[PDB]
Design a protein around this ligand. Structure first.
Ligand SMILES: Cc1ccc2nc(CNC(=O)c3cc(=O)n4ccccc4n3)cn2c1
Lengths: 200, 240
């Protein structure tokens, strides 16, 4: 059911099995990179313990990372059964295309993982560099949904820890800052009532 | 403007369209503080690395990856077998080139094996303005960059170098990496492993198999850092 769907929830406690299988998984997780963050974070084991393996049989994983999440995210990415096969970097600019620890950071990283044998994808249509203007902080550019749609068009995609601006067609956004539940694929609406007769 | 869309349409990588106080003093301070350049031909596989002394403040590591020759290649197997920790100083740094393949993972294993924590991930992003190819089997996207990993052990610049892509079969890494290293002021014992004749540089020691001449002598090399020079950052006025 092509249009946007989403589920406000805690991603730690949500039975993801009801949701089926996806050609692409994307997550921009609120990593505990210390620094007493202004948002709620997941601890390393909570990230480790997420139920990613039940989401895909053959497809790609997209995982934003920063700071120590570069090594951790690689851990989670292998622990979940993926192989890091690419790594996109987003170069942050301003409205006139100039760039915004030890070095000042001009980019943010996004590990690309694969699982199983995926077939039908148009690998190699985009390159691994995104150049886009920073909107709000903590956000991530819209261009990645273009790259992902070209990669695997018309297929089911799931986002984890999505915020409301993340809701896109062909996609299902999960996250704790969303407006309730909005489900249109009947197979999902059925497995959801079966598992959650009275909401969660 | 969607520049990923543009690349899909026109062949121009999104990095093609990135546009572009005076810290010139801390440049003449490096230039005066630099030791005379020192170099040494060596087959680093066959070569006992401990014979390189004293312990280095900075190690720059540029091993020849198979992927550099799309058109001897060290595997990450060979690289990880290197005994880096034996010549690195208690407090020291490392800059490791990792390409864009398995090296982005395997090189982090190296970093931890030699006892460093990654603090900085430096990206050489290659513009193709002069010519709008092959993909790795497992590659999802066109690879248009290389990564240089930064590691520390013990207790001004940006993390991006943008240059045009080098001609096929040219393998130099941009000299901007040296500027970024030197502006950190990390010490004066600087080792460039797998450098070439063209990478020799004042302030550095270059060890590599393709070097055509040598002038290394551990005693002479140590004489540049005996007191009262043992601790200089590389960014200070010389002592008389
Ligand atoms: C880079 C960045 C920074 C902030 C940020 N916030 C979100 C949205 N967060 C969530 O959806 C979510 C869902 C959930 O179940 N949680 C359960 C326990 C604790 C937190 C928690 N957060 C993405 N972000 C990316």
């Amino acid at each position: 059911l092509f249009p946007p769907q989403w589920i406000c929830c805690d991603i730690r406690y949500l039975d993801v099995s009801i949701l089926g299988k996806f050609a692409v998984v994307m997550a921009d997780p609120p990593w505990d990179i210390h620094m007493e963050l202004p948002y709620g974070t997941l601890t390393d084991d909570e990230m480790r313990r997420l139920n990613i393996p039940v989401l895909q049989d053959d497809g790609f994983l997209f995982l934003w990372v920063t700071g120590r999440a570069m090594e951790l995210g690689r851990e989670c990415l292998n622990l979940w059964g993926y192989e890091r096969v690419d790594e996109i970097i987003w170069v942050k600019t301003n409205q006139l295309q100039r760039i915004i620890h030890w070095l000042n950071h001009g980019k943010e990283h996004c590990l690309v993982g694969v699982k199983g044998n995926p077939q039908g994808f148009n690998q190699g249509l985009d390159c691994d560099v995104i150049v886009a203007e920073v909107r709000s902080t903590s956000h991530k550019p819209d261009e990645i949904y273009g790259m992902i749609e070209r990669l695997s068009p018309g297929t089911r995609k799931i986002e984890l820890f999505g915020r409301p601006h993340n809701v896109q067609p062909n996609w299902i956004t999960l996250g704790n800052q969303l407006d309730g539940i909005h489900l249109l694929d009947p197979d999902v609406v059925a497995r959801f009532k079966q598992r959650y007769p009275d909401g969660i | 403007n969607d520049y990923c869309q543009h690349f899909v349409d026109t062949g121009h990588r999104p990095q093609n369209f990135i546009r572009d106080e005076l810290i010139r003093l801390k440049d003449e301070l490096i230039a005066k503080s630099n030791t005379p350049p020192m170099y040494l031909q060596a087959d680093i596989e066959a070569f006992d690395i401990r014979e390189l002394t004293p312990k280095f403040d900075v190690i720059l590591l540029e091993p020849p990856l198979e992927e550099y020759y799309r058109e001897k290649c060290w595997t990450w197997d060979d690289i990880m077998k290197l005994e880096i920790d034996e010549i690195a100083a208690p407090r020291s740094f490392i800059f490791l080139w990792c390409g864009s393949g398995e090296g982005l993972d395997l090189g982090r294993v190296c970093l931890r094996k030699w006892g460093y924590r990654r603090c900085e991930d430096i990206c050489w992003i290659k513009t193709n303005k002069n010519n709008p190819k092959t993909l790795d089997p497992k590659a999802v996207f066109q690879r248009t960059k290389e990564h240089c990993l930064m590691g520390i052990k013990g207790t001004v610049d940006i993390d991006l170098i943008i240059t045009e892509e080098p001609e096929i079969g040219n393998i130099e890494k941009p000299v901007e990496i040296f500027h970024i290293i030197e502006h950190f002021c990390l010490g004066r014992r600087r080792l460039h492993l797998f450098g070439r004749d063209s990478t020799i540089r004042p302030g550095w020691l270059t060890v590599g198999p393709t070097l055509t001449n040598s002038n290394y002598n551990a005693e002479t090399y140590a004489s540049y850092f005996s007191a009262p020079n043992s601790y200089l950052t590389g960014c200070t006025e010389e002592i008389e």
